[PDB]
Structures are given as C-alpha cells and as structure tokens.
Amino acid sequence: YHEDRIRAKFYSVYGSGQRAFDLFNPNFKSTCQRFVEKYTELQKLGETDEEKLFVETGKALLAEGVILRR
Amino acid sequence: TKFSIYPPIPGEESSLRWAGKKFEEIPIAHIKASHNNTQIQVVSASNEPLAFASCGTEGFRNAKKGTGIAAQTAGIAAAARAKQKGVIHIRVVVKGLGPGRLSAMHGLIMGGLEVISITDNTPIPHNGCRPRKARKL
Amino acid sequence: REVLQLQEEVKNFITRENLEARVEAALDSRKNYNWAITREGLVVRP
Amino acid sequence: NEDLPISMENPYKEPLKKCILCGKHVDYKNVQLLSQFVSPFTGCIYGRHITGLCGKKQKEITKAIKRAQIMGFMPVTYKDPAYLKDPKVCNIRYRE
Amino acid sequence: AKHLKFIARTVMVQEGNVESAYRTLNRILTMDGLIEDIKHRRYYEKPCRRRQRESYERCRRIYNMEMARKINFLMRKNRADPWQGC
Amino acid sequence: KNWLKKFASHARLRALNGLLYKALTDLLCTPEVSQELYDLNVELSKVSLTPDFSACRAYWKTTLSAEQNAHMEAVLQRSAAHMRHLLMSQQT
Amino acid sequence: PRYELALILKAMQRPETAATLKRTIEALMDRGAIVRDLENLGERALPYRISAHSQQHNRGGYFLVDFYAPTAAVESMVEHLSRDIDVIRGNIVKHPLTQELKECEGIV
Amino acid sequence: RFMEPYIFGSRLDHDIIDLEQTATHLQLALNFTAHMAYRKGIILFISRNRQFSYLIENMARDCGEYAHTRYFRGGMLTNARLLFGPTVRLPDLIIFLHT
RNA sequence: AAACUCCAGUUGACACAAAAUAGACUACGAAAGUGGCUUUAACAUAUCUGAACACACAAUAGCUAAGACCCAAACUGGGAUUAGAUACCCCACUAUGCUUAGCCCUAAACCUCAACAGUUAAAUCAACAAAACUGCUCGCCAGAACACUACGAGCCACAGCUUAAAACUCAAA
Ligand code: FES
Ligand SMILES: [K+]
Ligand SMILES: [Mg+2]
Ligand SMILES: [Mg+2]
Ligand SMILES: [Mg+2]
Ligand SMILES: [Mg+2]
Ligand SMILES: [Mg+2]
Ligand SMILES: [Mg+2]
Ligand SMILES: [Mg+2]
Ligand SMILES: [Mg+2]
Known part of the structure; x- marks a missing residue:
C-alpha cells in the first residue's frame, strides 16, 4: 500500500x-498509524514533498502530545 | 601490569629483566627434535657454543635414541654442561616434531635451567623442494 | 574540467630547474600512508 | 476499488550488509591496515571466515599483502610488532 | 632466515608455567595450520589427490553445517507434550 | 560428484602395527584432532590389526578414576573417524 | 601512463641521499618522464635483511616518486635501478590512484 | 501450487487467503453438509491436529455424528468389511478440519 | 644392517629448482590448462549451424641437439628380510621432471550431457545417471566376435598415429 x-x-x-x-x-x-493518518491528511490539505510532510507530521504529533524520540 | 605473551622487541625498551640482563642477552637452547634423534645445543646471545648434548652422545643407540627418556637425558646433560658455564635462564628454540620435542625441555628444566620463552623454528617451505614419495607399506 | 585540473596541477610538478629545492624539501618532510580500521568500520589515523 | 494493493518494491527492504572495508581504498603501502589481517605469530594471511571481508576486498587485501611483502614494506614470517596493539577486527582467539 | 628472530612463533612463559606456554604454542601452530602443513609435507601429495581431498573436505564441512542447522532448528520442538492423552 | 547424495545415502602385520602405533601417538601429541582430546593426555599401549585387516584396535591405558575413563572413552569413540581421516590424509 | 616508483635507498647521510635522489630523477627525465612529486616515507628498519650489491642492509630510506612516463621507459628505468649501487630495492608500479574505485552495494 | 488460485497475495512473505472465495466455497460445503444431514447420512469428522482433538470429538458427539481424531490405521475405509464386519455401513460424508 | 664421519648443531653468505597462508574463493581460457611479485603487449565475430583429411592448437609420457641440476625418480647397484624372503622397508645414483629451438599428436582429453533457439504446459517418467521436452543443423550408429585387427592410403612418426574391412563361427551379445 x-x-x-x-x-x-x-x-x-x-x-x-x-x-x-x-x-x-x-x-x-x-x-505509526496515527503518523500515517496525519501524513495523509497533510498531503490532501497541502503540497506534496516527502520531507516537509514528514517534519510537519512530526511537529503536529508533538503538538497533540505524542512523544517521538529520534 | 598485564603480562605480555609476545616477546620483547630489541628496539622498544622494556622493563623485563632476568638476573639483570635483557631479553636479547639470554642464552638460547636450540633443540632439534628429529624422528630418530634429538640434539640440544646451548649457545650465548652472541652465538658462542656453551653446551651440546644429543641422544646419541648419552649412550642411547639406534631406536632408543628416538624416545622421550633419551631426549630427557640429553636435556639433563646439556643443562649440567651449561650450568657449569654460568647459564640459568634460557630461551628455547625448538625445531621439528619428533618424540623428543617436549622431553628435551623437561630435561633442561630438570637440570636447573629456567625457560623464559619457547620458540618454534620447524622448517616450513613455501613449496620449495619436492618431498619423497609416500611409503607403500 | 579534467584538462583545467591538469593545467593547475602542472604548476607544481618537479622540473630540472627546481630539482634541488624539491629534493631538499622532500628530505625535510615525511608522509604517512598508514591507518587502521575498527570493527565498526571507522578509520583510525595515526 | 481504492483499497486494493498496488505494485511497488519492498519499502521495508533492509540495505545489504557491507564489510568493514567497503568503499575504502586498500594500498600496499598501508602496512598498518594490512597487518590487521595476518597472524601475529606466523604472519599467515587470515581467510574470509576469520576476517569477515567480502570476496572482492579479501582479494584486494591478499594482493596488497603479497605486493608489500615482496617490495620490502611488510614482513612475511610474522606481523610487525609495531602494530600488535592496533584494533582487533579478526574473529580468532588463541587464548594467549 | 633473513627475518628477525624471537618474534615469529614465540611465546613467553608466565610464572614459570612452561607447560601452559608449550600447549599455547601448540594451539597457535595448530589453528594457524602450520602443524597440518608440516605433517602433509613429509611425503608428496599428487595434484589430483590434493584436489580430491580439498573438495571432499569442503563438501563435508558444508554438509555437516547444514545437518547441524537442521537439527538445531528442529530441536525447538523437543519439549514436554502439551496435548498428552490426545 | 553429488556429495549431497553421497552423504545422504605375519611379519607385515607387526610392521604395520608398529607404524600405526607411532602414528597414533604422534597424532595424540597435538591438538590436531581436537583440543578437548589434547587436554586428556591419552596414552596408548599397543596397536593390533585384525588378521583380515578389517579393524584396528588401539589399546589405551586406563586411569583409576571411573568418570575420567568414561569421558575418555566417549571422546575417543567420537574422534576415531577423524583420526582415520588424518592418518589416510597424511599418507602414513 | 602514471607510475609510482617505490625506492628503498641505502641508509646514508643527507648529502648522499640527496645526490642519489637527484640521480634517480635525472634518469627518469632522461628516459622521458614528467615527475609529479617526490615523497619521503622515512628511514626505517627493513622488514627483513636485504643483500644488494655485495652489501647487507637492515635499514633503509623509503621514497615514492610519482611520474608520467611512456610505456617503453619503464623497462629501461628498471635496468638503471639495477645498476645504481645506493638503491637497495626499486620497483615501479602503476599508480594506485589511476585504478578506479568501483562502488559496491554490499554483500549479496 | 494448487492453492495459488485461492491466495489473495503474500503480505511480507506470509500468504493471505482470499476470503471472498472462501465465502462461496464455505457456502457450497455447508449446503452439502446440511443436505446430507437432512437425508440421515453418516458424517465422519477427521483431524490429526492434537490441539483440537477434544473439541472435534465433543462437536461430533453434540451434533449426533462421528469423529476420528486418532491415529488412522491402515484399512479403515478400503478394508472396512474385514475390520468392522461384513455388514458395516461406511460414512456418506467425511469432513476434514485438517487435511 | 649398510651408508657418511671432507660428519652433525648454531651463525653468516648463497639457485636456470617450485611457488606455504590467502583459497571455507570458484575466477580466466576454445580445449588442453592456468593459483609467487612488477611492468609491456593482450583475451575474434552486431544472425545461427558448418570438416578424421582444410587452417591453427592439444595434459602426462617419449625422441633430437645444446645447457642447468636443489630435490624427486622409471631402471641399475648395495643393505635387511622367509624357507622360492618385502616387488612393498633402507642407502646411493641414472633416463626423466627444468630452460632454448624442433618433433611426436595420445588420455577416464569426462559434466562419459554435439552447437544455437525456445518451453515448463502436459502423460513427468522403461531403469539408473543428471527433472521432461520442442524447433533447426552438423557428426555418427544399424547383432556378437573376428577387430583400438589385416590390406589400401596418408603422416618429421618407421613397431608409431588416423581411417578401417572381409572369410569362417554363434544364437545370442
Ligand atoms: S561488501 Fe562492498 S566492498 Fe565488501
Ligand atoms: K570425469
Ligand atoms: Mg562457426
Ligand atoms: Mg566427414
Ligand atoms: Mg602433446
Ligand atoms: Mg618432456
Ligand atoms: Mg638427473
Ligand atoms: Mg617424470
Ligand atoms: Mg559441432
Ligand atoms: Mg594399427
């Protein structure tokens, strides 16, 4: 998929x-599934460049309050 | 200080001393362990022959030369003849895979000399001379 | 690009004019080609 | 139907394993590196089951060692004592 | 001959334990293949025989490793019976 | 030669006995067979060949401890084939 | 092509070493060579004893001469390196940098 | 190989069975079983998965049919006359929970 | 036991010989073959097949001249051996194994699989070997033995190599 x-x-x-x-x-x-849903929503409500979508999804999840340790 | 299995090198200074002398000044006991005979020669660091003893020189004859007891006797004789020349510590250099490979060193230790290092110098050609044909017994 | 790089490099070549100077400079110099590799794949220069 | 699978290469594919010398140049003058793949006591070149190198780099190391040995850069019968304290990369233990 | 002495095939004795040093030297020479080379170089091995021996040894190693892998893989199943009686 | 298939499927006598005795002692002097066997220091008394050359009986001296004897027996039967291969490969 | 000459020279004093280096480079140029660099690896104990010109050497000075020469020069130069009495061992190889560093994807 | 037409795909090296086809196959099988039961035919469940022997035997007892979850001896079906008696009635339907 | 004692050990100098470990790799070459290092040349063909004889090559052994000679070694001597010894073990030493220039042209020269192109659906399929086939081409084979033979012909070979029958006989091979 x-x-x-x-x-x-x-x-x-x-x-x-x-x-x-x-x-x-x-x-x-x-x-990861929440990350994927946020990524798809950001793709559908914005432009299509993989890296900006990745970083923006990370920012949005941290805004919601999910811990993501690199 | 961790014990080093590797020998000291002449260049790099080391604190290992044996009766006040450095590694490259200790006498060397050259053992040749052939299949029918064993020969021990003690030499100084400057290659001065001090003692010599083989299984044939200690009275053993023919097949009795190539046994452990004969090599032990030769080692004891060489150890005595070298002890009479001021040798205590020795570096053992063994050559060959005969029955007296280790019995000579037993004899040397039992004669009073202390072994500080064991070196093997068995001739291993990188395919030089052709060996003889296998025996058809 | 290769031709231009060769042009810039030729200026440092040894010639009959600068043989003494370059020989003495080399005698006053040392280069090391030795380096080690770790289990992790990292170069360890001396 | 939008939920059907689509054709693509495996995105979870783990990158192929690389040897410790992949991408690095092996010189016959770099005796320090070559001495990491020979026996300390005999100087015999270690096989790939010990060194862990790939076939290409194993061949490079072998040719470089032979070249250094015959051109007067590396000893044959033993490993140079100057490199005995270098990092150990070979899977062999003499229990010494 | 042309090499420095007391570096190759040399072992230092610890606390006078000559026996352990000799046995460690034997282990070194065996695992470096020097002992096998010495024993094999007593008589000449014809090239065809050497090739056959090397092939046999290689394929024996491969077969033994495969059989050991199979046995280790199927050893996980060896345990107490969970459905005893049925 | 389909190795996967293969694996899946008298005065003279005295001289041979002496030769094999010396060869087996020489083999046992080192870790060439195995380090474990080298540790046990097995000593041989004699080697006897059957009159039909169908089997080689190597008589090894036993110790006083029984568990040591059993361990030596086990490793010897596990290592006999390797000794045979080594003897035939050395062209003894 | 581009070649690297590995030179093991006798362990001499600075003036003799400089003269020998000049003589070697002059021979290279006389055979048509364009020398790129002269590089010193240092004076060191030889990995083994080398008997050259009826003299036994245990130490030597290691030098690297990078140059471009015609294919015919190499053999001729080798002959010269055989006659020079201050060279323990001289060997010409194709320069390692010319060999292409082919990329690898890893173990299959 | 013969299971290939029923496989939807391979998800990370694990085959997935197409449930759309399984639904129709199960419909046919269940209809056949029901029709055979209506006709008073002998139904014998068979399975050698020891984890489910008790469950299958209980099911067979419950629905008034027969089960064989044990070691299948040679000749149960092809030699039933010698092994049960000259007038034994063989099953009219056999259901494999494990083939 | 013979042999050596111009012997043996350490150390130093020192090949026209063969190339530890790497190589548990499986590469290069038409095959035969090729596994020490450097350098120079260098590994045909933008359809396929295409020869006992045409054109070029062919392990080991063997033969001409010259040369080298550590080690190994057909033969040749000697030592030790039962009761017709050990042909087999030991010692010494030849042709030969090596180099240069020519011959000879044979191998279980085998993956015992003729070269190219294609297929995995069939009934897979006498057996074994090495899963079963298709298209196209060249070579070869038609019971056994006589017979890797005789004769003819050809060849640096002179007994050699290639090609290769017939008569009698048998019911088998
Ligand atoms: S795995 Fe890439 S060079 Fe070895
Ligand atoms: K074959
Ligand atoms: Mg053609
Ligand atoms: Mg024809
Ligand atoms: Mg030929
Ligand atoms: Mg010849
Ligand atoms: Mg001769
Ligand atoms: Mg020959
Ligand atoms: Mg053809
Ligand atoms: Mg004929």
Missing part, C-alpha cells in the same frame, strides 16, 4: 514505538 512507504520511514526514523501492539483489538491504532 502507499502508506507502507511512510511506515518504513517511520520505522527507520522514530523506530518501533515503545507502546505495545494489541492485535486482538480490531481497531488498534499504533503511533
């Missing part, structure tokens, strides 16, 4: 989230 690319960058940049996956919950949302 398209988001896989984003996911890869996330898992290479911010690493695997300290929070544990819960695959029993049908509607679980990982930190």
Whole structure:
C-alpha cells in the first residue's frame, strides 16, 4: 500500500514505538498509524514533498502530545 | 601490569629483566627434535657454543635414541654442561616434531635451567623442494 | 574540467630547474600512508 | 476499488550488509591496515571466515599483502610488532 | 632466515608455567595450520589427490553445517507434550 | 560428484602395527584432532590389526578414576573417524 | 601512463641521499618522464635483511616518486635501478590512484 | 501450487487467503453438509491436529455424528468389511478440519 | 644392517629448482590448462549451424641437439628380510621432471550431457545417471566376435598415429 512507504520511514526514523501492539483489538491504532493518518491528511490539505510532510507530521504529533524520540 | 605473551622487541625498551640482563642477552637452547634423534645445543646471545648434548652422545643407540627418556637425558646433560658455564635462564628454540620435542625441555628444566620463552623454528617451505614419495607399506 | 585540473596541477610538478629545492624539501618532510580500521568500520589515523 | 494493493518494491527492504572495508581504498603501502589481517605469530594471511571481508576486498587485501611483502614494506614470517596493539577486527582467539 | 628472530612463533612463559606456554604454542601452530602443513609435507601429495581431498573436505564441512542447522532448528520442538492423552 | 547424495545415502602385520602405533601417538601429541582430546593426555599401549585387516584396535591405558575413563572413552569413540581421516590424509 | 616508483635507498647521510635522489630523477627525465612529486616515507628498519650489491642492509630510506612516463621507459628505468649501487630495492608500479574505485552495494 | 488460485497475495512473505472465495466455497460445503444431514447420512469428522482433538470429538458427539481424531490405521475405509464386519455401513460424508 | 664421519648443531653468505597462508574463493581460457611479485603487449565475430583429411592448437609420457641440476625418480647397484624372503622397508645414483629451438599428436582429453533457439504446459517418467521436452543443423550408429585387427592410403612418426574391412563361427551379445 502507499502508506507502507511512510511506515518504513517511520520505522527507520522514530523506530518501533515503545507502546505495545494489541492485535486482538480490531481497531488498534499504533503511533505509526496515527503518523500515517496525519501524513495523509497533510498531503490532501497541502503540497506534496516527502520531507516537509514528514517534519510537519512530526511537529503536529508533538503538538497533540505524542512523544517521538529520534 | 598485564603480562605480555609476545616477546620483547630489541628496539622498544622494556622493563623485563632476568638476573639483570635483557631479553636479547639470554642464552638460547636450540633443540632439534628429529624422528630418530634429538640434539640440544646451548649457545650465548652472541652465538658462542656453551653446551651440546644429543641422544646419541648419552649412550642411547639406534631406536632408543628416538624416545622421550633419551631426549630427557640429553636435556639433563646439556643443562649440567651449561650450568657449569654460568647459564640459568634460557630461551628455547625448538625445531621439528619428533618424540623428543617436549622431553628435551623437561630435561633442561630438570637440570636447573629456567625457560623464559619457547620458540618454534620447524622448517616450513613455501613449496620449495619436492618431498619423497609416500611409503607403500 | 579534467584538462583545467591538469593545467593547475602542472604548476607544481618537479622540473630540472627546481630539482634541488624539491629534493631538499622532500628530505625535510615525511608522509604517512598508514591507518587502521575498527570493527565498526571507522578509520583510525595515526 | 481504492483499497486494493498496488505494485511497488519492498519499502521495508533492509540495505545489504557491507564489510568493514567497503568503499575504502586498500594500498600496499598501508602496512598498518594490512597487518590487521595476518597472524601475529606466523604472519599467515587470515581467510574470509576469520576476517569477515567480502570476496572482492579479501582479494584486494591478499594482493596488497603479497605486493608489500615482496617490495620490502611488510614482513612475511610474522606481523610487525609495531602494530600488535592496533584494533582487533579478526574473529580468532588463541587464548594467549 | 633473513627475518628477525624471537618474534615469529614465540611465546613467553608466565610464572614459570612452561607447560601452559608449550600447549599455547601448540594451539597457535595448530589453528594457524602450520602443524597440518608440516605433517602433509613429509611425503608428496599428487595434484589430483590434493584436489580430491580439498573438495571432499569442503563438501563435508558444508554438509555437516547444514545437518547441524537442521537439527538445531528442529530441536525447538523437543519439549514436554502439551496435548498428552490426545 | 553429488556429495549431497553421497552423504545422504605375519611379519607385515607387526610392521604395520608398529607404524600405526607411532602414528597414533604422534597424532595424540597435538591438538590436531581436537583440543578437548589434547587436554586428556591419552596414552596408548599397543596397536593390533585384525588378521583380515578389517579393524584396528588401539589399546589405551586406563586411569583409576571411573568418570575420567568414561569421558575418555566417549571422546575417543567420537574422534576415531577423524583420526582415520588424518592418518589416510597424511599418507602414513 | 602514471607510475609510482617505490625506492628503498641505502641508509646514508643527507648529502648522499640527496645526490642519489637527484640521480634517480635525472634518469627518469632522461628516459622521458614528467615527475609529479617526490615523497619521503622515512628511514626505517627493513622488514627483513636485504643483500644488494655485495652489501647487507637492515635499514633503509623509503621514497615514492610519482611520474608520467611512456610505456617503453619503464623497462629501461628498471635496468638503471639495477645498476645504481645506493638503491637497495626499486620497483615501479602503476599508480594506485589511476585504478578506479568501483562502488559496491554490499554483500549479496 | 494448487492453492495459488485461492491466495489473495503474500503480505511480507506470509500468504493471505482470499476470503471472498472462501465465502462461496464455505457456502457450497455447508449446503452439502446440511443436505446430507437432512437425508440421515453418516458424517465422519477427521483431524490429526492434537490441539483440537477434544473439541472435534465433543462437536461430533453434540451434533449426533462421528469423529476420528486418532491415529488412522491402515484399512479403515478400503478394508472396512474385514475390520468392522461384513455388514458395516461406511460414512456418506467425511469432513476434514485438517487435511 | 649398510651408508657418511671432507660428519652433525648454531651463525653468516648463497639457485636456470617450485611457488606455504590467502583459497571455507570458484575466477580466466576454445580445449588442453592456468593459483609467487612488477611492468609491456593482450583475451575474434552486431544472425545461427558448418570438416578424421582444410587452417591453427592439444595434459602426462617419449625422441633430437645444446645447457642447468636443489630435490624427486622409471631402471641399475648395495643393505635387511622367509624357507622360492618385502616387488612393498633402507642407502646411493641414472633416463626423466627444468630452460632454448624442433618433433611426436595420445588420455577416464569426462559434466562419459554435439552447437544455437525456445518451453515448463502436459502423460513427468522403461531403469539408473543428471527433472521432461520442442524447433533447426552438423557428426555418427544399424547383432556378437573376428577387430583400438589385416590390406589400401596418408603422416618429421618407421613397431608409431588416423581411417578401417572381409572369410569362417554363434544364437545370442
Ligand atoms: S561488501 Fe562492498 S566492498 Fe565488501
Ligand atoms: K570425469
Ligand atoms: Mg562457426
Ligand atoms: Mg566427414
Ligand atoms: Mg602433446
Ligand atoms: Mg618432456
Ligand atoms: Mg638427473
Ligand atoms: Mg617424470
Ligand atoms: Mg559441432
Ligand atoms: Mg594399427
């Protein structure tokens, strides 16, 4: 899928989230998944340049209050 | 200070001394451990032969030369003849894979000399002369 | 670009005119080609 | 349907592993580097199972060592004692 | 011959433990392949025999490593029976 | 030669005995076979070849401890094939 | 092409070393060479004893002469390096910089 | 190989079964089973997965049908006359939870 | 036991010989072959197939001249051996293995797979070897033995190498 690319960058940049996956919950949302949704919303409501989208998504998540250690 | 397995080098100064002398001044015991005979020669650092003893010189004859006991006797004889010339510490240089490779060093130690280093100098050609054909026994 | 680089480099070549000066300068100089590599792939210069 | 998979190269593909000397130039004059791949006690060149180098760089190191040895830059029968305290990169232990 | 002496194949004795030094030298010579070279150089090995021996040794190493890998992989399954009785 | 398939599938006698005894002692003098075996310092008494040359019996001196004897026995049976290969490779 | 001459010279005093270096470079130019640089690696103990010109050497001075010469000069120069009595060992190789540093993607 | 037409794809080296096809296949299988049960046919469940032997035997007992979750001896079906009796009735339908 | 004692050990000087480790690599070359270092030349063909004989090459052994000679070694001597010894172990030393210029042209010269192009659907498929085939071309084969033979012909070969039958005989091979 398209988001896989984003996911890869996330898992290479911010690493695997300290929070544990819960695959029993049908509607679980990982930190990477929240990152992907914010990335897609920013893409659809703005321009398309991968790096600015990445940094802006990081800024927006930190604004919401999600910890992201590089 | 951590013990160094590697020998000292003549250039770089080192604090290792044996009876006040440095490494490159200790006498050298050259052991040749052949298949049928063993020969021990003690020389000084400046290559002065001090003592010599082989299994044939200690009375052992024919197949009895190539045994551990004979090499031990040769080592003891060389150790005595070198002790009579002021040798205590020695550097052992062994050559060959005969039965007396280690028995000579037992004899040398049992004769009173102290071994401070063991060196192997067995001739290993990088494919020079052609060896003989395998025996068809 | 290569020709221009060669042009700039030729000015420092040894010639029969500057043989003495360059020889003495070399005798008053030392270069080291030795360097080591770590398990992590990092160069360790002397 | 917009939810169907699309064709692309594996984005999670981990980059291929590289040897410690990948991208670096091996000179026959750099005796310090070449001495890291020979036996301290015999000077024998270590194989790739010990050095961990790739085949290309293993060949480069071998040719450089032989060239240095025959041109009078490196000893053959042992490793130069000046390089005995250099970093250890070879997977071998004599328990010395 | 032309090399400095007491550097190659040289081991220092610690606390007079000559036996340990000799055994360490033996280990060094064995793991560097010098002992095998000396033993093999007593008699001439014909080139075809040498080639066959090297091929056999290489393929034996490969086969043994593969079998060991298979056994280690299937050893994870060896445990107490979780569905005993059924 | 499909190695994967292969692996998947008297006066003379006295001289041979003496030669094999010397060769086996020489092999045991070093870690050439294995470091573990080298540690145990196994000593051989004699080597006897069967009259049909079907097996080589190497008589090794036993110690007084029983656990040491058992360990030596185990390593020896585990290393016999390697000794045979080494002996045949050295062209003894 | 571009060549590097590795020179192991006798362990001499400064004037003799300078004269020998001048003689070597003059021979190079006489054979048609354009010398780029003369580089000193230092005086050091040889890795082994070298017997040259009926004299045994344990130490020597290491020098590097980078130059451009015709393909025919090399052999001729080698002959000259065989006759000079102050050179322990002279060897001409293709300059290492000319070889291309091919890039690698890693172990397959 | 013969499972390929039923595979939606491979997700990071793990095959995924196409559930749209599974729905139709299950519909046909369940319809066949129901029709055979309506006709009073003998149904024998079979499975060698030891984790589910108890569950499958309980299910077979509950629905009034038969189960064989144990070691399958040679000749249960092709030699039933010698092994059960000359007038034994063989199953009319066999259901594999593990093939 | 013979042999050497102009012997043996350390040290120093010192090949027309063959090339530890790397190489657990699997590369170059038409094959044969090629694994010490440097340098110079240098690895044909923008369809494919295309020869016992045409044109160029061919491991090891062997033969001409010259040369070198550490080690190894057919033969040749000597030492030790039962009861017809050990052909086999030991010592000494030849042709030969090496170089230069010519011959000879044979190998389990084998991946025992003829060269190019294509396919993996079939029934996969006598057996084994090495999964089964298709298209196209050249070479070769039609029971065994006689016979890697005789004769003819050709060849730096003079017994050699290539090509290669027939008569009698058998029911098999
Ligand atoms: S892996 Fe790239 S040079 Fe070795
Ligand atoms: K073959
Ligand atoms: Mg053609
Ligand atoms: Mg024809
Ligand atoms: Mg030929
Ligand atoms: Mg010849
Ligand atoms: Mg001769
Ligand atoms: Mg020959
Ligand atoms: Mg053809
Ligand atoms: Mg004929």
